[PDB]
Amino acid sequence: KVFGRCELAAAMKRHGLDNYRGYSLGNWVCAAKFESNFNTQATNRNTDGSTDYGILQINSRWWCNDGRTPGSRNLCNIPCSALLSSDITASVNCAKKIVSDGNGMNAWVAWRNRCKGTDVQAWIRGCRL
Numbered sequence: 853k854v855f856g857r858c859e860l861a862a863a864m865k866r867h868g869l870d871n872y873r874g875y876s877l878g879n880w881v882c883a884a885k886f887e888s889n890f891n892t893q894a895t896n897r898n899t900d901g902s903t904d905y906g907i908l909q910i911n912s913r914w915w916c917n918d919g920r921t922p923g924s925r926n927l928c929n930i931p932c933s934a935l936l937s938s939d940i941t942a943s944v945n946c947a948k949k950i951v952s953d954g955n956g957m958n959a960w961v962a963w964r965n966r967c968k969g970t971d972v973q974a975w976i977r978g979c980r981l
């Protein structure tokens with residue numbers, strides 16, 4: 853599923869990401885935009901053999917199990933395919949663990965390089981939120 857910007861903003865807010873760990877909703881929408889282009893089915897292979905999955909490109913080395921990532925933990929205790937569903941619940945629960953693990957949203961390279969420090973409220977502009 854390719855979410856619309858406001859559709860994803862409302863889903864993320866409903867799933868409790870708005871201001872989670874102090875990150876405003878615009879940060880999460882921005883991160884999803886640059887990580888996956890709002891595509892729940894986005895998958896991207898890393899050079900170390902892990903894969904990034906879903907709307908928030910959650911990595912299989914630490915957070916989910918894909919059965920092909922040597923040295924992996926499954927700290928979200930979930931199949932990585934469950935991070936590709938049209939329902940982002942699993943991605944949000946896992947993202948909540950990720951952003952609470954110590955380095956905040958710097959866990960998302962696209963967020964750090966493209967969202968951090970920018971006017972992230974633009975990502976929720978016009979949404980009935």
Ligand SMILES: CC(=O)N[C@@H]1[C@@H](O)[C@H](O[C@@H]2O[C@H](CO)[C@@H](O[C@@H]3O[C@H](CO)[C@@H](O)[C@H](O)[C@H]3NC(C)=O)[C@H](O)[C@H]2NC(C)=O)[C@@H](CO)O[C@H]1O
Nearest residue numbers: 904908909910911913914915927950953954955959960961
């Ligand atoms: C969205 C996503 O999956 N991003 C991936 C990153 O999570 C990953 O970076 C590594 O993440 C782990 C888990 O947060 C980091 O571990 C934590 O590190 C801090 C110290 O920096 C420590 O306080 C935490 O206890 C520790 N947590 C655990 C569970 O051990 C780790 O430092 C990150 N490593 C690097 C090199 O950034 C990167 C790289 O694998 O991939 C992203 O896709």
